[model samples]
Target: KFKWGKLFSTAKKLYKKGKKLSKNKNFKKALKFGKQLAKNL
Candidate 1:
């Protein structure tokens, strides 16, 4: 449960961070994290 919760939290952070990255033209990193966020689910 703890591991899942931790990964879920990280996924949420990644989603938020991806938004910031996209606004900064960091598309590759943003996309990478976007995939990671999806993978978490």
Candidate 2:
């Protein structure tokens, strides 16, 4: 059977980090990290 994993915590971590960075106008980092989370899937 095929199996898979999830990144709920990682996504949430990156999401939280992004939120903090977002307040300072650092969207690129946020987008970059976000893409990373997507890649792990």
Candidate 3:
């Protein structure tokens, strides 16, 4: 049950990191992760 929270938070982190990476010009990785985030949503 505790790990459910971990899973959710990490996913949130995943999207945030992706957005930041795009701003930092790591667009390829960000785009990949962005698709993952969208799929997950």
Largest TM-score belongs to which candidate? Answer: 3
Clashes of each: 0, 0, 0
Clashes of 1: 0
TM-score, candidate number 3: 0.47
Error of 2 at 31 (Å): 14
Q: Give the 10-residue window scoring lowest on summed lDDT in candidate 1.
A: 21-30
Better of 1 and 3 by TM-score: 3
Query: Model 1, range 1-41, lDDT digits (tens) per residue?
Result: 25798889999999999787778868877779999999999
Off by over 4 Å in 2: 1-6, 25-41
Candidate 1 vs candidate 2, lDDT winner: 1
Task: Identify the candidate with maximal lDDT.
Answer: 1
Error of 2 at 36 (Å): 26
Tens digits of lDDT, candidate 2, 2-31: 332346767778999867878775777777
- Provide the lowest-lDDT 10-residue window in model 2: 1-10
Q: Model 3 clash tally?
A: 0
